[PDB]
Amino acid sequence: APSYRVKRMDIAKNDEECVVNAANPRGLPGDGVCKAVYKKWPESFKNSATPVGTAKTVMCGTYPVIHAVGPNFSNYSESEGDRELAAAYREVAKEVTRLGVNSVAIPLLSTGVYSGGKDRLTQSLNHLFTAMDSTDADVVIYCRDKEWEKKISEAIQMRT
């Protein structure tokens, strides 16, 4: 019987079960948790360029790195951007489920990092839930700040 949880786990452990990152489509530095992963794994960033609207898995020797292009729609409108970001989630969930892994650690993205400087706690939640609905594996949403993690936890309590 599958489930979901929230915790705070530094992705730089290298979660063998699955790792997902948000990388700039142009391969420029100044990006999400992908920046941190890159500093451990140069090869992950090597030709990490992938178009918006998709996801690109690469295998860095050990464990697959699913690169996704969500908030990095800064070269795109809000209307198209919602569609492309949604497609990126379906691709992420599809690669995860295809790996057929027991669990998966997914960072939350869509938090304004490259777009027009706005997060949307509700938007990130709904989007993650959509991806999650498209995965059987025991998925964990991973948070960073303590108080922001708390809000996600409130959403979990509110969604049972």
Q: With contact defined as beta carbons under 8 Å apart, do 8 and 143 qualify?
A: yes
Side chain identity at 138, as an amino acid letter?
D
81 marked ligand binding residue: no
**149 burial via Cβ count (<10 Å: 0-12, 13-18, 19+):** middle
Which run of H or of E encompasses 158? helix 146-158
10 marked ligand binding residue: yes
Q: With contact defined as beta carbons under 8 Å apart, do 73 and 52 qualify?
A: yes
Q: With contact defined as beta carbons under 8 Å apart, do 71 and 34 qualify?
A: no
72 marked ligand binding residue: no
21 marked ligand binding residue: no
DSSP state of 76: S
Look up residue 151 and give its two tokens: 């809000």
Which run of H or of E encompasses 102? none
27 marked ligand binding residue: no
24 marked ligand binding residue: yes
State the binding site for ADP-D-ribose. 10, 24, 32, 112-114
Annotated binding site: 10, 24, 32, 112-114
